[PDB]
Design an enzyme around this catalytic site. Structure first.
Site, mmCIF file in Angstrom:
data_model
loop_
_atom_site.group_PDB
_atom_site.id
_atom_site.type_symbol
_atom_site.label_atom_id
_atom_site.label_comp_id
_atom_site.label_asym_id
_atom_site.label_seq_id
_atom_site.Cartn_x
_atom_site.Cartn_y
_atom_site.Cartn_z
ATOM 1 C CG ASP B 65 -1.942 -1.066 1.271
ATOM 2 O OD1 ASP B 65 -1.669 -2.368 0.736
ATOM 3 O OD2 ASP B 65 -2.937 -0.874 1.818
ATOM 4 C CG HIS B 67 -3.364 3.843 1.817
ATOM 5 N ND1 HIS B 67 -4.409 4.025 1.266
ATOM 6 C CD2 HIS B 67 -3.360 2.959 2.081
ATOM 7 C CE1 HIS B 67 -5.332 2.882 1.293
ATOM 8 N NE2 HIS B 67 -4.546 2.071 2.037
ATOM 9 C CG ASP B 93 -5.708 -0.135 -0.529
ATOM 10 O OD1 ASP B 93 -6.431 -0.278 -1.540
ATOM 11 O OD2 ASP B 93 -5.649 -0.545 0.445
ATOM 12 C CG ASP B 96 -9.292 6.693 -0.490
ATOM 13 O OD1 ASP B 96 -9.352 8.025 -0.988
ATOM 14 O OD2 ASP B 96 -9.896 5.664 -0.824
ATOM 15 N NE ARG B 97 -7.539 4.358 6.150
ATOM 16 C CZ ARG B 97 -7.874 3.166 5.577
ATOM 17 N NH1 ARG B 97 -7.079 2.691 5.053
ATOM 18 N NH2 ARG B 97 -9.027 2.740 6.006
ATOM 19 C CG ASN B 125 -9.618 -2.444 -0.198
ATOM 20 O OD1 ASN B 125 -8.320 -2.385 -0.218
ATOM 21 N ND2 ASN B 125 -10.023 -1.952 0.581
ATOM 22 C CG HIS B 126 -8.615 2.412 -0.374
ATOM 23 N ND1 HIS B 126 -9.153 3.613 0.222
ATOM 24 C CD2 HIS B 126 -8.460 1.492 0.561
ATOM 25 C CE1 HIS B 126 -9.276 3.253 1.667
ATOM 26 N NE2 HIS B 126 -8.967 2.072 1.699
ATOM 27 C CG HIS B 174 -5.014 -4.638 -2.015
ATOM 28 N ND1 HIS B 174 -3.902 -3.779 -1.807
ATOM 29 C CD2 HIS B 174 -5.878 -4.342 -1.286
ATOM 30 C CE1 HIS B 174 -4.194 -3.150 -0.873
ATOM 31 N NE2 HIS B 174 -5.327 -3.253 -0.381
ATOM 32 N NE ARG B 229 -9.760 -5.442 5.551
ATOM 33 C CZ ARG B 229 -8.833 -4.985 5.264
ATOM 34 N NH1 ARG B 229 -9.007 -3.527 5.318
ATOM 35 N NH2 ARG B 229 -7.378 -5.408 5.256
ATOM 36 C CG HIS B 256 -6.414 -5.513 2.347
ATOM 37 N ND1 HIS B 256 -6.935 -4.521 1.867
ATOM 38 C CD2 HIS B 256 -7.014 -6.632 2.532
ATOM 39 C CE1 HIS B 256 -8.363 -4.567 2.241
ATOM 40 N NE2 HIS B 256 -8.548 -5.760 2.360
HETATM 41 FE FE LIG Z 1 -6.656 -2.486 1.151
HETATM 42 ZN ZN LIG Z 2 -4.852 0.003 2.423
#
Ligand SMILES: [Fe+3]
Ligand SMILES: [Zn+2]
EC number: 3.1.3.16
Lengths: 9, 311
Positions: B65, B67, B93, B96-97, B125-126, B174, B229, B256
């Site tokens: 990741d 992010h 990923d 985000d974040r 997933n993001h 991921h 999740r 992940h």
């Molecule tokens: Fe993830």
């Molecule tokens: Zn992540």
């Protein structure tokens, strides 16, 4: 089968 | 501040000037909106021609990741080697974040345009509409660029491959496995060009996790609904080993889940003696406390070299 080498900081 | 022009970003052969981009983007410097759209859509068109399941030869550096943490992405390339002479596989990923999501996207897409055959990007997933609407990416796109740029990113994310078969030994994703993915052909047959559904094999590839007690299961349930999740599954150690044996693979490399040291090697296979699962996580994370550390995986010369950085 490969070997694993961990390099830490 | 100055918005970079097409002539400033691309040379006469159409190659992105990634050193110029890097210096400008880390200052949150912006491109002209048409130039950002060019980067996103050119990269998307390259991704669209790729298979659901990439064939990636060693040597390769595998990254988890990011992010939106652009300064750590810059460090990762220093640690992992220049993309000009290093093969790369990212496990998703990107957004985000963190604070620099659109900058990470534009830079990685530029690198994909420049190195289409040696730098590879998977979907996390993001990389979808639902999560970028829930977190900050959708708002950041509209602010710094436009909704058209957000929509282009969403269409580009739809083009991201879902998995990689690495050196014919490792399945890289991921998240993980699915009760509906028992062979590599199960991945090949998916239609990936869409928002990830709320359930099903595409969802599970992006969302699933190993059980908390992976390797010491109290029951025999291969897949159990994932209560962390709120979707997809936890997969067990027998679930993974059965997939590995049936498909003549050595391990699953995934991301992940953040880890204390930037990586985790799970219980070894009873057949090969090699870790059945490896999590790699390639930028800082804020779960309980802040953790600056991260790692990448460099597979080369039959050596799996986990390289920690950002100490
Ligand atoms: Fe993830
Ligand atoms: Zn992540």
């Amino acid at each position: 089968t490969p070997s694993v080498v961990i390099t830490v900081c | 501040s100055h918005r970079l022009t097409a002539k400033e970003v691309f040379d006469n052969d159409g190659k992105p000037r990634v050193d110029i981009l890097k210096a400008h983007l880390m200052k949150e410097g912006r491109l002209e909106e048409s130039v950002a759209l060019r980067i996103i859509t050119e990269g998307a068109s390259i991704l669209r021609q790729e298979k659901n399941l990439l064939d990636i030869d060693a040597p390769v550096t595998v990254c988890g990741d990011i992010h939106g943490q652009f300064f750590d992405l810059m460090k990762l390339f220093e640690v992992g080697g220049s993309p000009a002479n290093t093969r790369y596989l990212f496990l998703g990923d990107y957004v985000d974040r963190g604070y620099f999501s659109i900058e990470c996207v534009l830079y990685l897409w530029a690198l994909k345009i420049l190195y289409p055959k040696t730098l590879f990007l998977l979907r996390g997933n993001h990389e979808c509409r639902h999560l970028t609407e829930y977190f900050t990416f959708k708002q950041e796109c509209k602010i710094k660029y436009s909704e058209r740029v957000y929509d282009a990113c969403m269409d580009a994310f739809d083009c991201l491959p879902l998995a990689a078969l690495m050196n014919q030994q490792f399945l890289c994703v991921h998240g993980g496995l699915s009760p509906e993915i028992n062979t590599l052909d199960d991945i090949r047959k998916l239609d990936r060009f869409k928002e990830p559904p709320a359930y099903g094999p595409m969802c599970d590839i992006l969302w699933s996790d190993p059980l908390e007690d992976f390797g010491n299961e109290k029951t025999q349930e291969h897949f159990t609904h994932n209560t962390v999740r709120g979707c997809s599954y936890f997969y067990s150690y027998p679930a993974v080993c059965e997939f590995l044996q049936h498909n003549n693979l050595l391990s699953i490399l995934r991301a992940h889940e953040a880890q204390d040291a930037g990586y985790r090697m799970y219980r070894k296979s009873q057949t090969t003696g090699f870790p059945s699962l490896i999590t790699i996580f390639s930028a800082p994370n804020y779960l309980d406390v802040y953790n600056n550390k991260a790692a990448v995986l460099k597979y080369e010369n039959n050596v799996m070299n986990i390289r920690q950085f950002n100490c």
